[PDB]
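Components:
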Amino acid sequence: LGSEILNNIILNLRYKDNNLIDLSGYGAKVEVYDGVELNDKNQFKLTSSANSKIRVTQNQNIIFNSVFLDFSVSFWIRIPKYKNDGIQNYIHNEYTIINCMKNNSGWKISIRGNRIIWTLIDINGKTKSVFFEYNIREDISEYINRWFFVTITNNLNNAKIYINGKLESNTDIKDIREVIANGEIIFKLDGDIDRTQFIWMKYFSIFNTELSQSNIEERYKIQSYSEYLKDFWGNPLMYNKEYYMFNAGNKNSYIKLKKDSPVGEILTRSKYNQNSKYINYRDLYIGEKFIIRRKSNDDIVRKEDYIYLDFFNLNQEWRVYTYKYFKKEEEKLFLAPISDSDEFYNTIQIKEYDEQPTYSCQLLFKKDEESTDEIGLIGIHRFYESGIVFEEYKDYFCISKWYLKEVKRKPYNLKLGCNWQFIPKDEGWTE
Amino acid sequence: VESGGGLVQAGGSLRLSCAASILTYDLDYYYIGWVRQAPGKEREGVSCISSTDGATYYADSVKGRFTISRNNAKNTVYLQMNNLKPEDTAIYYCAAAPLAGRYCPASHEYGYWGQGTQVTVSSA
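Structure:
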């Protein structure tokens, strides 16, 4: 519902009672029309429909004028992937998503494909822009259809764009003067958009100061904090939801039940196959479909929860176990039907060892929920089945004692092969 | 940047070094490894060492002949190659990768590469 606000906050849009409200203390009027989907996780969806809009009327009844030259805008956003057959429109058609104009002066936020654009228009109408563009040729993108944090700061000399707390862009704007900023704010997709186009946003805020990088980084962490884990897209991780599994230490690797052994072999993700020169990605919807079950008033997965990691093997739900007696530093996990046996552990404690914001989680096998003894962490290990030839190997879905010490190190090793993320089907990702 | 390469009679010795303060400016935890490529062949991982606890790994093809080490203070990495054979002839690259698992990175998993140093072993 916000992060850090040291008297510089002048607009603070937050969810309240199936509505959005300005909690800044300036009492702006907010009108959410019917085409806007809201939820109590403070996310709102702008669509292509005419009634999908928000009008914020800022408070003109106050004597105090809060913004002169210095001001900042912050929000989280989730931008759906290009449609593979619609790359040309994606690349060329720019659309406004937030517009604040009064007397041919103000600001706007717009999107053109994989680019998000901040535009300033001073009181004379003179215009400057700054943008952040993310790669659409990554095997695995940090940005495409995943929640990320934008902060835009403005002073006399510079317009800056921070992404997830880090400075990414900077435009000199000495040649424009101040912008008249008290106008209506219209959240609405405006441009030559596909009928299918949409955008999700969250925690929209305006500040009457230029936020320091220090401040933005703090706000990033505070607004990232949750007691629950997240999936790959950054939404709350859920029980009873079908998920593909991603490994942050092995981005292009996915798990498949071996055809003649009750173990999970690791294979390489297939990639974009249709020869457009503008795009590349690795496929996400592959490997076994996993599902998380509660071991036991909502379906949200929280840190330190005890779980069963299951997956679907044709039309049966199977389970991931560890054989109780393994002497080696790591061992292949046992994938089999749901079953009780005193020769196998089946209880996993889901973990979050990283102290910085992340969508990765870790999976800890323990004897019993009760015991303090730690068996190992689920991760990928390598097996040289011929000679030790570094380029000829077989990777496997394993439990590992080695990761137990490795997760202790600070700062957290983001790239450990015991870092997992869960990917549900999402309408913002087609392949 | 690698150095130390050159022409060596069989089976003599050679010590490669790499200033690996580059290749590692992005990584808090990493493997530094040596990958070589012979003129008609695919890249061949030969050895690596972890920034973590100095664990070392070797390909069977160089076992008992190669030793990898690290100065730490100068952040320099060394490869001692003993009893070289003509099969060892190649360009040798020093590379760095994230510390993902308890095993040496495959050649495609290395993220930052040096420019390589030529090593030639002759006879006859």
